[PDB]
Structure formats: C-alpha cells, structure tokens
Enzyme design. Structure first.
Site, mmCIF file in Angstrom:
data_model
loop_
_atom_site.group_PDB
_atom_site.id
_atom_site.type_symbol
_atom_site.label_atom_id
_atom_site.label_comp_id
_atom_site.label_asym_id
_atom_site.label_seq_id
_atom_site.Cartn_x
_atom_site.Cartn_y
_atom_site.Cartn_z
ATOM 1 N N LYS A 9 0.840 -1.189 0.000
ATOM 2 C CA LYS A 9 0.000 0.000 0.000
ATOM 3 C C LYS A 9 0.877 1.243 0.000
ATOM 4 C CE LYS A 9 0.912 1.133 4.427
ATOM 5 N NZ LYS A 9 1.536 2.388 4.932
ATOM 6 N N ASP A 140 -2.333 -0.686 10.358
ATOM 7 C CA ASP A 140 -2.501 -0.757 8.914
ATOM 8 C C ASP A 140 -3.182 -2.035 8.449
ATOM 9 O OD1 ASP A 140 -1.532 1.712 8.214
ATOM 10 O OD2 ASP A 140 0.482 1.017 7.673
HETATM 11 C C1 LIG Z 1 2.392 5.280 9.685
HETATM 12 C C2 LIG Z 1 1.474 4.261 9.017
HETATM 13 O O1 LIG Z 1 2.237 3.363 8.259
HETATM 14 C C3 LIG Z 1 0.489 4.988 8.104
HETATM 15 O O2 LIG Z 1 -0.162 4.026 7.323
HETATM 16 C C4 LIG Z 1 0.677 3.491 10.072
HETATM 17 O O3 LIG Z 1 -0.057 4.403 10.847
HETATM 18 C C5 LIG Z 1 1.600 2.674 10.977
HETATM 19 O O4 LIG Z 1 0.895 1.540 11.396
HETATM 20 P P1 LIG Z 1 1.691 0.098 11.480
HETATM 21 O O5 LIG Z 1 2.643 -0.056 10.317
HETATM 22 O O6 LIG Z 1 0.704 -1.048 11.477
HETATM 23 O O7 LIG Z 1 2.592 0.063 12.845
HETATM 24 P P2 LIG Z 1 2.094 -0.640 14.241
HETATM 25 O O8 LIG Z 1 2.723 -2.003 14.352
HETATM 26 O O9 LIG Z 1 0.585 -0.746 14.246
HETATM 27 O O10 LIG Z 1 2.593 0.326 15.467
HETATM 28 C C6 LIG Z 1 3.965 0.478 15.689
HETATM 29 C C7 LIG Z 1 4.215 1.684 16.579
HETATM 30 O O11 LIG Z 1 4.069 3.051 15.707
HETATM 31 C C8 LIG Z 1 3.497 3.949 16.425
HETATM 32 N N1 LIG Z 1 2.199 4.358 15.828
HETATM 33 C C9 LIG Z 1 1.614 3.567 14.762
HETATM 34 C C10 LIG Z 1 0.311 3.983 14.172
HETATM 35 C C11 LIG Z 1 -0.379 5.207 14.670
HETATM 36 N N2 LIG Z 1 -1.647 5.606 14.093
HETATM 37 N N3 LIG Z 1 0.212 5.997 15.727
HETATM 38 C C12 LIG Z 1 1.509 5.583 16.316
HETATM 39 O O12 LIG Z 1 1.988 6.234 17.180
HETATM 40 C C13 LIG Z 1 3.323 3.269 17.820
HETATM 41 O O13 LIG Z 1 4.390 3.656 18.584
HETATM 42 C C14 LIG Z 1 3.345 1.784 17.536
HETATM 43 O O14 LIG Z 1 3.831 1.055 18.757
HETATM 44 MG MG LIG Z 2 4.029 -0.916 9.390
#
Ligand SMILES: C[C@](O)(CO)[C@H](O)COP(=O)(O)OP(=O)(O)OC[C@H]1O[C@@H](n2ccc(N)nc2=O)[C@H](O)[C@@H]1O
Ligand SMILES: [Mg+2]
Ligand SMILES: Nc1ncnc2c1ncn2[C@@H]1O[C@H](COP(=O)(O)OP(=O)(O)O)[C@@H](O)[C@H]1O
Length: 282
Positions: A9, A140
């Site tokens: 994505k 995500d």
């Molecule tokens: C930045 C993006 O990639 C935009 O699509 C996403 O919001 C990130 O989501 P993700 O890849 O699934 O990462 P996750 O495994 O869910 O979270 C990892 C860490 O990133 C930070 N995190 C993530 C998503 C969010 N909306 N706020 C945050 O502060 C948190 O510290 C979390 O502990």
């Molecule tokens: Mg991620």
C-alpha cells in the site's frame, strides 16, 4: 494448495492530527494498494498445527505476523465454536516487499492470512470481525482486510472507501531501515495538522507529515527523494524509508526507472483501488 496475493500500500497523503494517551497518533490518510506484493500459499492441515515453512529474514516464527494472524484467528474461532476440529495450515510466502521498508508488507501479510484462513477453515467471520482482529496486530492491517482504497481516520481503522486515480508509481527503497517508532516519537514530528474534509484534502496538495523528519534524519531518504523530484512529484509513504514518484503512464515511470541509479532500489507498479487479494477472492 491455494495462493493468495498480499499487496503493498501507499499513503497517497498522510497528516498527523494529534496523539492519544496510549501513545498512538490520530491521522488523516489516503490508502491505495499497489498491484504488486507478496504471494502467500496455504495448504490445510488436519492436525491443528500452524507452520510457517518459509522464514522471513530477521523474524522469529512466533513473532511473524503471518503466524500471529493465523493463531489469533484460530483462538477467536475456537472461543466461539467456529473452528472445525483439526483446523491447521502449512503457510509459505514469496516475499517481494522489503521487510520494514515502508510499503506495509507485514501488515498486508497478516490481513491476507486472516482473510484466506477465514475462508479456508470456513470460520464465517465478518469483515468487521476480521478487521477488528487485524487492528490488534497493526494499525494498517484493517485497510488490507477490508480490501478497498480508503480515506482513513482514527489510527487507520476508520475507513471510508474512496477511488483515487490509479496512477503508475516508481517505488524506491533508500538504503536504510527506519523503525516506525523513531519517526513517531520524534519531538519535531507534526502532530497538530488541522483535521480537514475529504473534499479539502482531495484538492489540497498531497504530502506526508513524516517526510520532513525522515529526509532530515536519514540522508539516504533525502538522496532518493532529491533524485526523483527532478522527474515527477515524489513523496515518502508510511514512515519511510520508502519513497514513491507519481506518473500518469507506465512508459514514463519505466523510463525514469531505467535511468535510476541502482541505489534507488526501484520498481514500477500501478495503483489499485481494489485489493488484488479481494479481487482474487471473487
Ligand atoms: C504510519 C502508518 O504506516 C500509516 O499508514 C501506520 O499508521 C503505521 O501503522 P503500522 O505499520 O501497522 O505500525 P504498528 O505495528 O501498528 O505500530 C507500531 C508503533 O508506531 C506507532 N504508531 C503507529 C500507528 C499510529 N496511528 N500511531 C503511532 O503512534 C506506535 O508507537 C506503535 O507502537
Ligand atoms: Mg508498518
Ligand atoms: N510477515 C512479515 N513481513 C514483514 N515483516 C514482519 C512480518 N512479520 C513480522 N514482521 C516484523 O514487523 C516489522 C515489519 O513491518 P512492515 O509492516 O513490513 O514495515 P513497513 O510498514 O515500514 O513496511 C518488522 O519489525 C518485522 O520484524
């Protein structure tokens, strides 16, 4: 044996509007898929095991989002009598998306396993239930579970389907690994971007609030961005390090790629408003 797409994505835009007390950030973003990603193959087991046969570099089996997804679905289904006795699976993945590169490959892997095994084990869970389980695995994961390009609020789970232009993209991976927490804990990260309407957002220039930090702290993100901005609109996706440039046609995007130095680690792919996974599910 069954084979299941696990697409990447892009965040066509990404705005940080605030931060809740649990540490997570409220945002406004526009997800679109790429017709490009990993392939996950599943073979059902009758002994109730879950085995990831192909290791993902640097990831322990039980830490792998593929396994965690499968075990989470197994536990939920069995807690409510929706798991035929002996349900299990041998899973293997052909990984094309760089681990932690910025395209959300792990997030997408979990979603595909949830949707696929929900179908193969005949658990009959709804999309909302699957997406609700996905959210515990990653902010995500829900977009991938629900399978359509979407305007996203909350932490990424409040999804409104939208249909952005399916442009062509040159997706480049700078030679550096950016841990998502680094960006999100940076004191200079915008966390006050005004919450706006989809109509305001669809008209304003697309940008990524994480870009200024990524480019400043990681010179290899800045290098890749600077090279691509000479050719087309270019932005960071996710929290990096991945960068993409936008094009209206495959030929232009591929011509820029043919010129790109090897350190861009680039590929070209088209955006897809319908996830290749949900497309294959039909
Ligand atoms: C930045 C993006 O990639 C935009 O699509 C996403 O919001 C990130 O989501 P993700 O890849 O699934 O990462 P996750 O495994 O869910 O979270 C990892 C860490 O990133 C930070 N995190 C993530 C998503 C969010 N909306 N706020 C945050 O502060 C948190 O510290 C979390 O502990
Ligand atoms: Mg991620
Ligand atoms: N199946 C998987 N594919 C990729 N990474 C995984 C997987 N399972 C667990 N991980 C772990 O989670 C992270 C992968 O995050 P990912 O979503 O690929 O990053 P990004 O969103 O920056 O592309 C790494 O810390 C990696 O160790």
């Amino acid at each position: 044996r069954t084979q299941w797409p696990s697409p990447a994505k892009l965040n066509l835009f990404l705005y940080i509007t605030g931060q809740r007390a649990d540490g997570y950030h409220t945002l406004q973003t526009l997800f679109q898929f790429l017709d490009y990603g990993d392939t996950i193959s599943i073979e059902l087991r009758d002994d109730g095991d879950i085995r990831l046969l192909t290791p993902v570099e640097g990831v322990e089996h039980e830490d792998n989002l593929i396994v965690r997804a499968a075990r989470l679905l197994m536990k939920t289904a069995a807690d409510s009598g929706r798991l035929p006795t002996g349900s299990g699976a041998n899973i293997s993945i052909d990984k094309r998306l760089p681990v932690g590169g910025g395209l959300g490959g792990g997030s997408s892997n979990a979603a595909t396993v949830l949707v696929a095994l929900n179908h193969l084990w005949q658990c009959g869970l709804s999309m909302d239930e699957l997406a609700e389980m996905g959210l515990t695995l990653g902010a995500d994961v829900p977009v991938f579970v629900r399978g359509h390009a979407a305007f996203a609020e909350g932490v990424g789970e409040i999804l409104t389907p939208v249909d952005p232009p399916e442009k062509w993209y040159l997706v480049a991976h700078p030679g550096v690994s950016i841990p998502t927490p680094v960006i999100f804990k940076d004191p200079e990260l915008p966390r006050n971007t005004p919450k706006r309407s989809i109509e305001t957002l669809l008209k304003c220039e697309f940008s990524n609030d994480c870009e200024v930090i990524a480019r400043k702290r990681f010179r290899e993100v800045d290098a890749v961005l600077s090279w691509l901005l000479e050719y087309a609109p270019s932005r960071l996706t996710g929290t990096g390090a991945c960068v993409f440039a936008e094009f209206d046609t495959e030929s232009e995007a591929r011509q820029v790629l043919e010129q790109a130095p090897e350190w861009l680690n680039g590929f070209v792919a088209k955006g897809v408003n319908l996830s290749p996974l949900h497309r294959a599910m039909l």
